[PDB]
């Protein structure tokens, strides 16, 4: 009844092998002879050599422990977490008593990396990443003087509406987690989990309840001014009215549990915009400091 | 498969003989691949054959004033190329590949190329003043054709990424001096388990002549470049639309 | 005082936390709860209990509210026209907004709004005829004829002895739902559709009524789950609630 | 030991037990996998039986 | 209150620390990460992957940007002159600034910028000739002739069937890099050098081209390590980044 | 089909889940539903006026203060839960005072 | 409020309050109000050898005795090594003298 | 016990496991040297073989 | 908050004390000190030379 079938795409033989646990290296190799050692014997100069092997005080004997330096410091400040060590000042939200920047107390901010070009440079060596997040908040007057006042913080998950006015019920809500603390108290250490809808951070169609990706016909990547609905922040001044002091809030983001994938060449042009790595195609520049000649330095 | 099916020609412009040049690393089709998982009410299937043979798209010519060319995937798997009979209907796609590049020249030519595959190679366009943050990504540039497209500024890779550090990705050095073969294998690379048939274009293939082509007068002034590919382990499924019959 | 350290996270207040509580009445023992049946263990098992679904949601008045639930299958045209179509979006608008599955979807962000349905026929006893039910996968246009809809996936109903049919929707996830860094820039949303076609005319012996009514049900099964608890937003208020 | 509901009655068998502890090492009311009164997962003798052939008597 | 002690280190805030965090969303389980290939384990294994290196970094315009990478070996003089020289400083300026090893060195203070290199020849097929490659240890002057450079350590290349050569640099640490208690008083910096000498003239049969091009590579191995994580300072900004 | 249950039932040779461990998969229980703590009481004390002149202010537990909360809580007939309360006091302009 | 920061050897010198070196990411910083208890802190062994000894140990350039390629000046901050920096937190001046 | 990724899928085998603990005695996600699913260091039968003499067939 | 007690000795500062320190640079490993001779163990053995 059935007359057609073909898949193949297989190989047979030495696929796998025995199962052991021997994580200790042993003397490997020795020597082998070739020919008459000469300088200009005719074929090739500058001949080679070989060794046998040894691994610290573990492998082979442990009679003498003569390391290069008598235990100066640690030798592993190169991992991914080590690279992503500090916590840079990402957010610099400013609240005046009166003015045009933030008159109604409310101030909306969202997570991004383009705020720091250096941070973007350091973070765009790869394609796929997966990390947690933390945040710390410091509030001070422009002249640096603590005052008695209460503040309201809240995190906004992706796709949640935007609280615009102080009277917005989104301030009340129940689902958006909120934090209350006086500014005289120590800063508000807090963590944020991995909120992406995939296994790695990558933009395109990931935001908005509607469609997305390239070549729009059914969606706008605008969402008014808050483009790319994602994890944002909100902050008020607690009170039925205005406050009595100017405020200068600050943010401190810090990665943790960092894992990368697929490295790529870093960058050799100045950044121009957000979410669109353009460059100065008419003002293309070299990379290193060029010298005069090649024969001389 | 084999070397025949519809396309049976096995002799290019130089009409070469005396065996072939492949230089295999793996052991003759090292097994099948996986199926992964999902998180929704969708599930794909397999088309088996009719995509398991070889394909040889058009040959682009190398000259002294050359700058380099690039390709996008799976743009050439669609109607933009030889195929296009089972590429625009379904919704999900995923496959490995067996890409082979064969060049040809006499013993009197000089120059050297460079092949490289850059995953998620999103072009930043020519830019240079075209102020665009997020309005409308182009379709007339990112999908040139099965012929590829010549680069504008290879040193910055027409995106701003330096050409010097390219060798991080898998790569071979096409050198006119000694050999003419280039075989590369690229597995599936995507964050999501399965890709779409739309603007989620996978890795792009780059070819840049670093060592310029040169010769003496009277010889052949142009060297052809062949491109072949083999879609190991491909799938196709997914479709739902307006009035059906 | 004690060999402690000043802690740079205290003195604050979190709304989604827990910790050392403080009972106020030590001398207390509340009434021991006896086993009363119908104890609900999870917010699920409300997402797969059958609930009737409105499709003919044309009327908007008060008296005619009834026929929002069922739709006619009378015998005027019976070869190749369409009965009704809809989407598969649970918590946006339209049909699923009336059932319980959509009502529960209106409390999360990761939904399906899919899977098995059921159609119960109310023909008298002597009605015969065949209906064509087809499903269109996401990212596809609805067929312009019955032949095109016949392709892909479909099922042919009958009225002889069926009185029921349970089509099931598959589940597929390929693209990005919403990756808005800001709102008002992206409007790209699409979903598969479901259609009903008159296969054959509605046969009836001389003496039986002409118009019947097909009802529709809705449920799910144990594959998909809701996620990302977000606060529901509604208008179910009147201001004056004394 | 074990308490039936809290004092005398029945019904809060595996619902409410014990009260509380200190402010640093406290606990709550729940159940375990070992040390029960009686496991209630004992039933289901039949699982697949014959495929279809039950009783075509009529 | 409790038998504790007042702690004279609390209430402060450190930027390079860690401690008891505070999750905000308890009901959450992020997407389980599947094994996607190309997972990088350490900032290393980028410091020994081959990357082409510019030495002829004379041009500074836009069109002529290409030949910064390779240099000519044409046959005009072929007995005893010099081709090109450079230093071994990774993260200061010049050649290594263009490769990836120097780019990674620009993030630490304890570097080497050394070890094996590679030269790939692009002669047509029929070019023969010998090149002299020599290395000068630190604290030494570059030889004024080919004979002096021949001494010490060196290697003689050829074009018959080589098409490649991999010289390796040793690693030596004797003096003090920088012990500045203040800046502007000390300007004592030096490093070994590498030179290329025309051993014999560039032979060619009548019919082949005259000028060829040698390319150069760069890499390291598993001996040296970077240290003292310091913040990189650059100018890769434009101010206007909307 | 036949049947299989994760890496427990049958073999455990390959563990290919749908997503490489994105997050937790149990944010649907009753407690998960009743997660946040909404602002129920908004007692207001003026220095002088008509609302609460004599300092005292009486309030009682209820749910009708929030129609949304009542909607969410009236899906059932019988319930049995504990309770907690937290109190925040501030001036209308938001300035702590000694009291 | 006050801002403290440690500067490792070879790092640049923040001269003005507007210097981005105040921002940085690599130089560890400490923030604490002065009303709080003092800021106890530790510093590891930062020398590039196995013992403290001056001469050629500072500056990215050369050093030691008999200079020809380097100055042991580095402007005013001679012998670049572990230094400290301190500001007054605020977009402007402060209101009190400090010691 | 042990969880494959977290709930059903595969891929986060030795990547993500468990969740968290108290605010004083907490932990994280990692792997140990004992009590694995399967050690992946089993290969490398050949290590040095013959020095040079492989196959001078041509 | 916690079942603690207010401690009538904290908030002060002593000049001849010790306690929980605070390292600033986690990614660090100072040079491993080799055995250089002439290591002095105690302020004594200078009082009888
Ligand atoms: C829409 C913005 C990017 C457009 C495409 C350009 C490059 C595509 C791949 C990189 C962008 C997404 C992948 C993640 C990159 C960075 O690591 C993320 N911003 C992490 O925060
Ligand atoms: C450049 C300053 C010193 C000039 C040489 C004079 C004496 C040389 C040996 C002593 C100076 C360096 C060795 C260390 C001495 C003191 O213990 C260090 N300052 C420790 O802080």
Author numbering:
A (entry chain A): 1 to 297
B (entry chain B): 10 to 254
C (entry chain C), E (entry chain C): 1 to 242
D (entry chain D), H (entry chain D): 12 to 69
F (entry chain A): 51 to 149
G (entry chain A): 150 to 248
I (entry chain C): 1 to 49
Quote the passages of the study that discuss this structure, keeping the authors' original sentences.
Enteroviruses particles are composed of single-strand RNA (virion RNA) genomes encapsulated by an icosahedral capsid of ~30 nm in diameter. In this study, we genetically perturb this equilibrium in a non-enveloped virus, enterovirus A71 to determine its structural basis. We isolate a single-point mutation variant with increased particle thermotolerance and decreased efficiency of cell entry. Using cryo-electron microscopy and molecular dynamics simulations, we determine that the thermostable native particles have acquired an expanded conformation that results in a significant increase in protein dynamics.
The particle was reconstructed to a resolution of 4.2 Å. Strikingly, the K162E particle was larger and resembled an A-particle conformation of the WT particle. The thermostable K162E capsid had expanded from 300–330 Å in diameter. The expansion of the K162E global capsid can be attributed to both the enlarged capsid protein shell and the increased volume of the internal cavity, which accommodated the virion RNA. As well, a hydrogen bond may form between the new glutamic acid 162 and asparagine 108. Although the resolution is insufficient for robust conclusions, the Coulomb potential suggests a potential new conformation in the VP1 GH loop (residues 204–224) and VP2 EF loop, which could modify the exit of the pocket factor.
